[PDB]
Design an enzyme around this catalytic site. Structure first.
Site, PDB file in Angstrom:
ATOM      1  N   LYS D   1      33.513  36.002  44.165  1.00  0.00           N
ATOM      2  CA  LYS D   1      34.600  36.626  43.418  1.00  0.00           C
ATOM      3  C   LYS D   1      35.478  37.485  44.319  1.00  0.00           C
ATOM      4  N   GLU D   2      34.866  38.232  45.238  1.00  0.00           N
ATOM      5  CA  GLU D   2      35.608  39.137  46.105  1.00  0.00           C
ATOM      6  C   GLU D   2      35.810  38.600  47.516  1.00  0.00           C
ATOM      7  N   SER D   3      34.936  37.714  47.990  1.00  0.00           N
ATOM      8  CA  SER D   3      35.040  37.199  49.346  1.00  0.00           C
ATOM      9  C   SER D   3      34.604  35.742  49.372  1.00  0.00           C
ATOM     10  CB  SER D   3      34.199  38.024  50.328  1.00  0.00           C
ATOM     11  N   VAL D   4      35.116  35.016  50.362  1.00  0.00           N
ATOM     12  CA  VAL D   4      34.806  33.607  50.567  1.00  0.00           C
ATOM     13  C   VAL D   4      34.133  33.459  51.923  1.00  0.00           C
ATOM     14  N   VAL D   5      33.005  32.753  51.943  1.00  0.00           N
ATOM     15  CA  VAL D   5      32.199  32.568  53.144  1.00  0.00           C
ATOM     16  C   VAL D   5      32.383  31.139  53.636  1.00  0.00           C
ATOM     17  N   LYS D  30      33.586  35.566  56.709  1.00  0.00           N
ATOM     18  CA  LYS D  30      33.786  36.067  55.354  1.00  0.00           C
ATOM     19  C   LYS D  30      35.191  36.653  55.267  1.00  0.00           C
ATOM     20  N   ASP D 146      22.871  46.537  45.629  1.00  0.00           N
ATOM     21  CA  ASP D 146      23.197  45.232  45.072  1.00  0.00           C
ATOM     22  C   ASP D 146      22.080  44.250  45.397  1.00  0.00           C
TER      23      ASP D 146
END
EC number: 2.7.11.1
Lengths: 178, 61, 135, 208, 213
Positions: D1-5, D30, D146
Site C-alpha cells: 500500500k505504501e511501498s513497492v518492492v 523499495k 508492526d
RNA sequence: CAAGACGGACCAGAGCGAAAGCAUUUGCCAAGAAUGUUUUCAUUAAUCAAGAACGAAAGUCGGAGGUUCGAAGACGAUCAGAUACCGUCGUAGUUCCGACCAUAAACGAUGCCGACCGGCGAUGCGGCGGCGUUAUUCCCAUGACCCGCCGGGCAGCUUCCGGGAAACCAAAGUCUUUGGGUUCCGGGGGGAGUAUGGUUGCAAAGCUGAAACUUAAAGGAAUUGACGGAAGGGCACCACCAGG
C-alpha cells in the site's frame, strides 16, 4: 504563630480591593488562615491560627497573594494555590540585551504583538502565564515550561522576528513531549 | 603578544610592551593599506578586461 | 549535642538560599554568620549537570539540611533569599521557592524571609555583549 | 500500500576503492508511494520521534517520504549492527532504498504465515522471533510495532525481520503498548501454529 | 570522621538594656584549643536582629547590626553597631510619581562615637490633589535637605549613644522632620534609613557595664 | 582593608543645552532661556560664499591607572559537508590628562526667520486673579493643594481648515485662485561617492569628485489573497462509537 505580609502597590490597590472577596474566600476556606489588609502599611498579611490544617499552606497563600499582586489573573493564582509545582519566574527586560529608551519599548512589542497575540500564542504553546510589567516579564508554570518560556521570550527580545520565534517555540514544545 | 599582564609589573615593562603592540599595529595597518591598493589595481584591470570582452571577442564566426 | 534550652524557646539560625542558574546553595549559619553548620549543594545529590538547578535537587538539599539542623538542635531558621545579583538576573529562581517550600514541609519553624541579594546601585558592565543574551 | 518492492540484479562496480561497499548479486529496491492519499494516518509514529520532530513539524509529503526512507535505512543499519537477521542497505536515493534481497534465483523468501513448517521448525522459529524481539528491545533500543506473520520471512532455517520503517524507539509515548501488541500478535501466531511452549502476551511483553 | 560539632560550644547572646526582649539567641563557637582563645574569636561578630525581636510593639521593617565585645561565662555583651531598613520595605517605598530626598550626615557624638547616618523622605500627595504629579522643585529639595541635616545634627551631636538610640526606636527624628517640613513641602514618609558606624572610641568596660546593667 | 568603575530604583511622552549630549551631596566659578517692567539704545535686523568654535562611539600620537567587559588571539561542543552557532580565558581598547581625527540610521528621515489659519484637556517655567484646605486652629506676611486667565515651551487627543500618490500632516495648510525674505541641495537605475587631481591628516581616513561602459525599469504609498509547510470549528452509518 507566624505571619507573612505581602506589600501591595498603589497601581494594583483597586484591582486587589475589587477582588478582595474572591481572594479572601479560598484563603480562609481551603487553607484556614486569617487575612487582613493593613491600610497604614498597605500590606496584605496572612497569619496562621488554631484552624490551620497543616504546614506549607501559609507559603502557598503567600505565593497566591504575590501572584495576584504581581498582575496575574485570579484563576491563575487559584490554580497555583491548588497545584504543587508552580513557580513565578521573573526577568527584567534589560537583562536580555542592553536596551534604552524607545527601542526598549519596541522590544516589549516584540514580546507582546498586536493585541497580545504573540503573548497569547506563547502562553498557549508553552502552557505558561506571562505578565509584561513596565520593565519586567513574569512567567508562571512548570520548570521545563518556564525554561521554554524564558528561551522564547529572550529570543524575541533579542531582535528575532516573531514568526521564526513562534516556529522555534513550537519545535521546542513538540520536542519536549508536551 | 598574548601575554596577560600581572599586577607586579612596573614602568619600562608595560611601556615597552604597549610600544611594541603599537608597532605591529602600525605595521599591520601599513600592509592593510598595501593590500587595499593591490586589490584596487587588480579590480580596475579586471574590470577593463571584462568590458573589453563585452566590446570585443564575443561571437561565433 | 546541642543548645541546653527548654522546649519553649526555639534556637534561631540563618539559612541562606542562593539560587543560581547552575544550582542552588542552601547554607545554614548562626545569627552571626561566622561559624556555619551545614552547606548542601545541588551537586551533593544529583549526579548530573541539567538537574543541578532543578527543584528536585533543591528539595533534596533542603531535606538534608533540615535533617542536619534537627540533629544539632537548630529548631528555627531565618531565611535570607539570594540570587546571583550583580549585573546578572536579580530575581531569585524557582529553586529558591522550591527549597523554602521543602524546608517548610520538614517541620522547620520559619522566621523572617529577607530577600538579600547583592543588588548593585549601578553595574560595571553587563557580561553579555551589545548583541544579546540567552539564545 | 505504501511501498513497492522490486527484485533486481546488481552490477559489479569496477572501482577498486578500499571503502567501497560490496554490492549483492540480487537486490531489492523499495520505492515508497508518493501519489497516494492513504498516508494521513502514519503521522503518529513520526511526530513522536525525537530524531526528526523538528523535521516532521514542517515536512512536505515528498520530504516526509524521504524522511521515512531515511528512518527505514537507519533502522536497517541498527538491526544489522546488532546482528539481527535483516537486509543490508547498500545505498539510499530519495524515496528508493536498495537493500540485500532475501532469497535465491530472483525468488523472494516466503513469509512465516505461508511457510508450512513442522512442529520443531515452528518452535525454532518462535524461539528465533523471541530472540530477535529481545535483541531489538535491548540492543537496538527500538520497537518494531508492526511485527506479525507477514513481516517475518523464513530463509535457510532463519527468521528475517522486514518493514522496519514503522519502527520507533522505546522512549516514544506509546512504544511500550505497541511492543505489547506486537508480542500479543506473535503469541497468537505461535498459538495458532501449535507451539505449546509459546508464552502468553503478558509473559512475552515481560520477557522482551 | 570526628564530628566538629562535639568540639563546639553554645554561647548566649543577649540584647542590651535598651530593648525589651533580652535573649537574642545562641551562637556556635569553636572552643579554645590552647593557641587561639574562643573569646577573642567571637569578639568581632555582627548580628542582624529585627526590631520586633527586640520590642513587641515596634515595627518589623527595621534591622539592627550589633557587635559583641565581651564574654561573661557563656554570655555575650553586645553593643549597638548600626541600623538599616528592610529591603522589602525599601522596594515598597519607591512609588512612581513621588520625589525622593536622600541625605547623609557624619556626626561625632558626645561620647566619641562617630556615625554615618542616612535619611530618606518621600513627598506627600494631598487630600484633594487631583494632579498626579507631586514633584518638588530642586531648591525646595535642597532647603528640605539642609533642614534635615541641621535637625539630625541638632538631635544627634548634642547627645551620646543612649539618647540617639532611644530616639531612633520610635523615630522621633523622623516625626520631627516631617513636622518641620510641612512649611516647605508636605512630606509623606521619612525615616532614618541607614546607620553606619564610622569611628569607635577606645574599648573599655564601664560604658558597657551601664549599657547592659 | 584596597582598587578603579558607575551613579539604578526615584526617572515622567518631564527638564536643560546650538547640536553631540546632560542624573550621588556640598561649595565656588562664569554663563543661560522664559517671565515682569509707563527702563535704555533706536533699525542696531533675517539668511548666509569665504572663514571659524563645538562635534557620540570607534580610531591615532604622548603619560597615568587598569574593577568589570572585551576587538584580536587561545580552548571545548555540533555534525552527509560547520568553518556560523554556543559556553571558558584573554590583548589593544573601554577610564582619566594633553593634542590629532570631524564621521554616524549625527533622524522630527521634516533648513532658518516672519504672517494668517479649528477645538479640547493635561504638563513644565514665570506672572496675575482668586471660595475654600494644611505649617499641631499658625499672632501678620509666607511655603504645599483647588478654580481660572496670560506668555514662551515639551508633547498628546480629535476635525470634511485645507493639502496630498497615499500613509498621513494644524502644517507637510494659506500651490495652475501658482510671487513674504533667504541658504543649501535632487534630476531614471547602476558604474560610484569609484578612478584621477587638489587640499587637510602621523596614519586610518576626510572634503571636493568624474567618465567610459551598462539597463527599462529601479523605486514610493496604500488594496486584496493563490498559499500557509497557521490555527479553529462544523458536517456525513457512501465516516466513527454501541452494535446488527
Amino acid at each position: 504563630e507566624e505571619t507573612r505580609k505581602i506589600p501591595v502597590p498603589a497601581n494594583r490597590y483597586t484591582p486587589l480591593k475589587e477582588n478582595w472577596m474572591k481572594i479572601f474566600t479560598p484563603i480562609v476556606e481551603h487553607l484556614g488562615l486569617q487575612i487582613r489588609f493593613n491600610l497604614k502599611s498597605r500590606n496584605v498579611e496572612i497569619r496562621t491560627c488554631k484552624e490551620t490544617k497543616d504546614v506549607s499552606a501559609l507559603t502557598k497563600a503567600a505565593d497566591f497573594v504575590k501572584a495576584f499582586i504581581l498582575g496575574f489573573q485570579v484563576e491563575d493564582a487559584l490554580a497555583l494555590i491548588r497545584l504543587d509545582d508552580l513557580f513565578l519566574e521573573s526577568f527584567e527586560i534589560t537583562d536580555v540585551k542592553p536596551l534604552k529608551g524607545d527601542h526598549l519599548s519596541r522590544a516589549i512589542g516584540r514580546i507582546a504583538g498586536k493585541g497580545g497575540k504573540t503573548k497569547f500564542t506563547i502562553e498557549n504553546v508553552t502552557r505558561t502565564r506571562i505578565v509584561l510589567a513596565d520593565v519586567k516579564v513574569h512567567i508562571l508554570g512548570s520548570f521545563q515550561n518556564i525554561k521554554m518560556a524564558r528561551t522564547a521570550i529572550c529570543n524575541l527580545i533579542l531582535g528575532n522576528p516573531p514568526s521564526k520565534v513562534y516556529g522555534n517555540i513550537r519545535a521546542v514544545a513538540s520536542r519536549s513531549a508536551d | 603578544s598574548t601575554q596577560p599582564r600581572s599586577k607586579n609589573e612596573s614602568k619600562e615593562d608595560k611601556r615597552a610592551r604597549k610600544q611594541a603592540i603599537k608597532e605591529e599595529r602600525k605595521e599591520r595597518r601599513v600592509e592593510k593599506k598595501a593590500n587595499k591598493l593591490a586589490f584596487k589595481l587588480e579590480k580596475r584591470r579586471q574590470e577593463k578586461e571584462l568590458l573589453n570582452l563585452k566590446k570585443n571577442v564575443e561571437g561565433l564566426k | 549535642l546541642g543548645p541546653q534550652v527548654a522546649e519553649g524557646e526555639n534556637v534561631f539560625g540563618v539559612c541562606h538560599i542562593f539560587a543560581s542558574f547552575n544550582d542552588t546553595f542552601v547554607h545554614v549559619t548562626d545569627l552571626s554568620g561566622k561559624e556555619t553548620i551545614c552547606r548542601v549543594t545541588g551537586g551533593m545529590k544529583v549526579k548530573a549537570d541539567r538537574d543541578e538547578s532543578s527543584p528536585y535537587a533543591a528539595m533534596l538539599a533542603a531535606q538534608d539540611v533540615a535533617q542536619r539542623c534537627k540533629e544539632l538542635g537548630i529548631t528555627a531558621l531565618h531565611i535570607k533569599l539570594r540570587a546571583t545579583g550583580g549585573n546578572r538576573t536579580k530575581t531569585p529562581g524557582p529553586g529558591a521557592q522550591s527549597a523554602l517550600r521543602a524546608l517548610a514541609r520538614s517541620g522547620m519553624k520559619i522566621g523572617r524571609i529577607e530577600d538579600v541579594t547583592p543588588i548593585p546601585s549601578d553595574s560595571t558592565r553587563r557580561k553579555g555583549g551589545r548583541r544579546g543574551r540567552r539564545l | 500500500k505504501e511501498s513497492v518492492v522490486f527484485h533486481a540484479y546488481g552490477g559489479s562496480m569496477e572501482d577498486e576503492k578500499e571503502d567501497s561497499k560490496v554490492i549483492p548479486t540480487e537486490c531489492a529496491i523499495k520505492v515508497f508511494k508518493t501519489t497516494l492519499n492513504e498516508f494521513k494516518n502514519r503521522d503518529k509514529y513520526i511526530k513522536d520521534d525525537f530524531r526528526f520532530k523538528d523535521r516532521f513539524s514542517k515536512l512536505n509529503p515528498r520530504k516526509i517520504i524521504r524522511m521515512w526512507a531515511e528512518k527505514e535505512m537507519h533502522n536497517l543499519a541498527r538491526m544489522q549492527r546488532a546482528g539481527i537477521p535483516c537486509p543490508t542497505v547498500v545505498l539510499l536515493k530519495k524515496h528508493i532504498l536498495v537493500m540485500s534481497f532475501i532469497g535465491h534465483d530472483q525468488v523472494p523468501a516466503p513469509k512465516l504465515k505461508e511457510v508450512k513448517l513442522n512442529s520443531e521448525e515452528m518452535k525454532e522459529a518462535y524461539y528465533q522471533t523471541l530472540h530477535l524481539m529481545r535483541q531489538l528491545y535491548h540492543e537496538c533500543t527500538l520497537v518494531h510495532a508492526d511485527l506479525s506473520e507477514y513481516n517475518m520471512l523464513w530463509h535457510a532455517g532463519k527468521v528475517w525481520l522486514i518493514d522496519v520503517s514503522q519502527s520507533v524507539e522505546p522512549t516514544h509515548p506509546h512504544g511500550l503498548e505497541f511492543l505489547f501488541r506486537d508480542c500479543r500478535n506473535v503469541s497468537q501466531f505461535f498459538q495458532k501454529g501449535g507451539v505449546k511452549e509459546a508464552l502468553s502476551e503478558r509473559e512475552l511483553f515481560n520477557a522482551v | 570522621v570526628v564530628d566538629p560539632f562535639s568540639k563546639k560550644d553554645w554561647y548566649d547572646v543577649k540584647a542590651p538594656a535598651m530593648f525589651n526582649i533580652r535573649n537574642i539567641g545562641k551562637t556556635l563557637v569553636t572552643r579554645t584549643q590552647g593557641t587561639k582563645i574562643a573569646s577573642d574569636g567571637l569578639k568581632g561578630r555582627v548580628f542582624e536582629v529585627s526590631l520586633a525581636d527586640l520590642q513587641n510593639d515596634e515595627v518589623a521593617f527595621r534591622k539592627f547590626k550589633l557587635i559583641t565585645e565581651d564574654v561573661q561565662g557563656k554570655n555575650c555583651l553586645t553593643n549597638f553597631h548600626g541600623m538599616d531598613l528592610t529591603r522589602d520595605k525599601m522596594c515598597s517605598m519607591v512609588k512612581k510619581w513621588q520625589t525622593m530626598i536622600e541625605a547623609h550626615v557624619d556626626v561625632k557624638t558626645t561620647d566619641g562615637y562617630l556615625l554615618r547616618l542616612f535619611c530618606v523622605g518621600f513627598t506627600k500627595k494631598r487630600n484633594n490633589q487631583i494632579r498626579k504629579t507631586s514633584y518638588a522643585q530642586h531648591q525646595q529639595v535642597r532647603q528640605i535637605r539642609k533642614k534635615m541635616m541641621e535637625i539630625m545634627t541638632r538631635e544627634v551631636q548634642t547627645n551620646d549613644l543612649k539618647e540617639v538610640v532611644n530616639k531612633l526606636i520610635p523615630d522621633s527624628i523622623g516625626k520631627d522632620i516631617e513636622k518641620a517640613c510641612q512649611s516647605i513641602y508636605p512630606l509623606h514618609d521619612v525615616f532614618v534609613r541607614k546607620v553606619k558606624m564610622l569611628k569607635k572610641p577606645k574599648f573599655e568596660l564601664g560604658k558597657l557595664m551601664e549599657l547592659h546593667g
